[PDB]
Structure 1
């Protein structure tokens, strides 16, 4: 006997038969060819296409967390930060506690805008040969014309540096981890897996909050919609958005008084610091398992309701943080209605979000910080909003609670399988309607296969038009649990409390 293996007797045969090219670049359409050469007689019955997506952008909206009355966590936080600022600024101050908190929320929307345009500037340096989505797909997902950023690099750099210089002239506490959380989410690129051909997660604000001081009936934060993906917006549009954001704050006396008071209370080492940007500044896609766990359990709440929204049967449901001194004893009030999808109709997919959510985690041992960070983008409906009128085309919902930000949409950027193989923009909620047409089933299947390329992708709740039936969470579960509205509301009420937290005076 010899008892040596065949692969050890001829290792050259094995190493020659298995030399294959791997690491195909993504961002590029690939045609697989035919194994049966005669199968071109079957036109669409043979799928020879292979498109890999690269960008899924989480479209979000910063919130204070469901204010109903003066006992809300943002009003308790307003009380604590005004007690801290007031007993560090001995003198005569004219603003209330809620004017100070609304100044802090407008400061947050400014910092999100600055990190947004800085991400537009810092993405455009990204190149790698093995991912062709860099950097144009990431710029398409942020709503900017990518050629405008390359052609006007110095004007863009001046604009973002002047946004940092202007918006950085107002003080905000860095002891609040609210600003640090939005800076963490809003200027980071996140891979779904620690590989080089990984797929990118991003966070883009759907809307920001514009201050809008009015009359004598307090203040009223109103939405300012950001560019959506596929819009080829240029630098002048972002300049108009910036000037619309700080129109009521630049060179304003009351905002300067509040900024100097926050400067004197929290010292210069205890304020937030905006980041500068040059031609050297670039961000690299990092692996963060805390980001992926809350992208996984994210639930999209729909489009923001504006003044120009024409909700049939739902007047006055526009999203606004209000501070009327004659209403609710002068409490900061924010309770938006969810389930709006931009149009004046029912959107039957939101019925699929009326079941209890699934909280899915990797591993088998879960920390309390891990569990509470994995639930930060989740938002469950609790009741239906009451239709005021005879008929009502849409159906709105009221949650039990939400965190410092709600998800509005997701935007997936892939390549088209038809020539010239340009990028494709697909915007979706967690819920997806498939109406009865032949051009919807294979397209929905393509979208589902595109979504399952993303590792900790949000859980899908599809529904069918002729089946009258929603299917549950389309996601691979590892170690799951069923959450109810009260548990998630407890976690939201904990996290809104922790984000708006300041120390004491001693």
Structure 2
């Protein structure tokens, strides 16, 4: 060949600088020097996004009866605590189970602040997003972690010490699943300049035992991305979390009874951190499998949230013993977008989802673990009133965690190329504006930069027509709501299961 005869000309001809370090703006330049008269018609910008954050919410699953897996697990752990290990008989099954859920929220908070501490020591020349973009996506000021890192470390250690006052079973996979999910960095590819997936809890459950009418886990809001929160705000959040937890007699005898039934080696163990413990991003395909099938349900509903025609639709877990035979009722109203309007794009999520999977042959565990974060709407919630500004949807069942939002961190194409935060569901609405089509195209390109990005459903407001899954398909199926509800029931039963 000619290439074998003259390899020197081929070598000197094709020496190009590869491996551009992502994290800053790049300008391609002009091939035509007279193209400056067409200013916006030539796109010389080139931005590579680096961080996608999955804003998740811990849930016990769908529950409207006593036949829910949460109530079955409550009855089983109550039998193991009292009827086999001599309990105190000052509480029911549901009080113990809501106490266990409060433990889950505590361990999620500890893994969250441990990830916040461990992220800030990551520095590399090939990625300029490390570690400021991850701290921006977590809603924490990076200067407050640069300046007082030792205070952050000792606060994390003190959280791990104070969380050991109560007890929780180690063999329950719910705790270790939430702690592993909330404390990981997951690259979308096995390359040195990959993109970071993340899991930030926006919801934490706060114990609210007031009155005789039963306990309740009220919502507690976590810092959203772009809010520069310091260590004092996280300490205030932690003290608000254990305000009604420590100093409670019922919680004290519950911790004593769990410490009696399960041994000292049978309880969970929060690991101590120090100055040499840092985490690196790992490649997890099973994380990408459930990230791909993740379906957003929108921002949660609080007591302060105003809804026209929807009163009392807050995301609370109730423990009223006078109604429903004292069941742990938790079924929320989805589709709320954070404010009081119609949110036309959420109608695109009313079709049956497409379960996409890598490879050709799929095991049962792969299909079950790929549908952990999926949620399909089933029936519209009937409003109590003649006028209704939003539209809410009741699901047919969800897993141990739902997805509310997503967060994109990428460099801006305009001066001075700082980080931009883009919050979006799977559904993206593009209304009548000349500045919204190019922004939506840039958001689409930034989404498809990631490998297993969730399947979007873009609604165009000027054509009154939405679009299906905007993702590349390899081996897919159509999932009905009944089969996904069955898989969610299996997942919630297996996660809350404890061995006796």
TM-score, with length taken from structure 2: 0.99
Are the aligned partners of 2:56 and 2:202 in contact in 1 as well (CA < 8 Å)? yes
5 Å-filtered alignment, 1:342-491, equals: 342-491=338-487
Are the aligned partners of 2:81 and 2:87 in contact in 1 as well (CA < 8 Å)? no
In structure 1, the residue corresponding to 2:247 is in which secondary structure? coil
Alpha-carbon offset, residue 98 of structure 1: 0.4
Q: What residue number does 1:133 align with?
A: 129
Once residues 268 and 193 of structure 1 are traced to their aligned partners in structure 2, the CA distance between those partners, rounded to angstroms, is: 40
Greater shift after overlay, 162-171 or 74-83? Answer: 162-171
Q: Structure 1 residues 91, 300: closer, same or farther in 2, change over 3 A?
A: closer
Are the aligned partners of 2:88 and 2:257 in contact in 1 as well (CA < 8 Å)? no
Kindly provide the CA deviation profile for residues 279-335 of structure 1, in whole angstroms up to 9, marking residues without a partner as x: 112111000011000000000001100001101000000010000111111110100
Kindly provide the CA deviation profile for residues 260-286 of structure 1, in whole angstroms up to 9, marking residues without a partner as x: 211121112221111222111211100
Kindly provide the CA deviation profile for residues 427-461 of structure 1, in whole angstroms up to 9, marking residues without a partner as x: 00000000010100000000000000110010000
Kindly provide the CA deviation profile for residues 94-130 of structure 1, in whole angstroms up to 9, marking residues without a partner as x: 1110000000000000000010011100000111110
Are the aligned partners of 1:313 and 1:393 in contact in 2 as well (CA < 8 Å)? yes
The number of residues matched between the two structures is: 500
Greater shift after overlay, 52-61 or 270-279? Answer: 270-279
Once residues 86 and 360 of structure 2 are traced to their aligned partners in structure 1, the CA distance between those partners, rounded to angstroms, is: 53
Alpha-carbon offset, residue 91 of structure 1: 5.0
User: Following TM superposition, where does structure 1 have runs of at least 4 consecutive aligned residues deviating by more than 3 angstroms?
Assistant: none
Q: Structure 1 residues 443, 91: closer, same or farther in 2, change over 3 A?
A: closer
Q: Structure 1 residues 204, 91: closer, same or farther in 2, change over 3 A?
A: closer
Kindly provide the CA deviation profile for residues 49-107 of structure 1, in whole angstroms up to 9, marking residues without a partner as x: 00000000000000010110211110000000111111343253311100000000000
Q: 2:141 aligned to 124, 127, 145, which one?
A: 145
Are the aligned partners of 1:149 and 1:156 in contact in 2 as well (CA < 8 Å)? yes
In structure 1, the residue corresponding to 2:407 is in which secondary structure? strand
Once residues 181 and 297 of structure 1 are traced to their aligned partners in structure 2, the CA distance between those partners, rounded to angstroms, is: 18
Alpha-carbon offset, residue 497 of structure 1: 0.2
Q: What residue number does 2:224 align with?
A: 228
Once residues 284 and 91 of structure 1 are traced to their aligned partners in structure 2, the CA distance between those partners, rounded to angstroms, is: 44
Are the aligned partners of 1:126 and 1:134 in contact in 2 as well (CA < 8 Å)? yes
Gaps of at least 5 residues in structure 1 are none
Are the aligned partners of 1:88 and 1:264 in contact in 2 as well (CA < 8 Å)? no
In structure 1, the residue corresponding to 2:54 is in which secondary structure? strand
Once residues 325 and 75 of structure 2 are traced to their aligned partners in structure 1, the CA distance between those partners, rounded to angstroms, is: 14
Are the aligned partners of 1:7 and 1:14 in contact in 2 as well (CA < 8 Å)? yes
Are the aligned partners of 1:353 and 1:381 in contact in 2 as well (CA < 8 Å)? yes
Q: 1:28 aligned to 16, 24, 29, which one?
A: 24
CA RMSD between the two structures: 0.8
Are the aligned partners of 1:65 and 1:402 in contact in 2 as well (CA < 8 Å)? yes
In structure 1, the residue corresponding to 2:326 is in which secondary structure? coil
Once residues 236 and 371 of structure 1 are traced to their aligned partners in structure 2, the CA distance between those partners, rounded to angstroms, is: 42
Once residues 96 and 113 of structure 2 are traced to their aligned partners in structure 1, the CA distance between those partners, rounded to angstroms, is: 26
Once residues 326 and 450 of structure 2 are traced to their aligned partners in structure 1, the CA distance between those partners, rounded to angstroms, is: 45
Alpha-carbon offset, residue 169 of structure 1: 2.0
Once residues 43 and 70 of structure 1 are traced to their aligned partners in structure 2, the CA distance between those partners, rounded to angstroms, is: 65
Once residues 163 and 241 of structure 2 are traced to their aligned partners in structure 1, the CA distance between those partners, rounded to angstroms, is: 10
Once residues 45 and 92 of structure 1 are traced to their aligned partners in structure 2, the CA distance between those partners, rounded to angstroms, is: 75
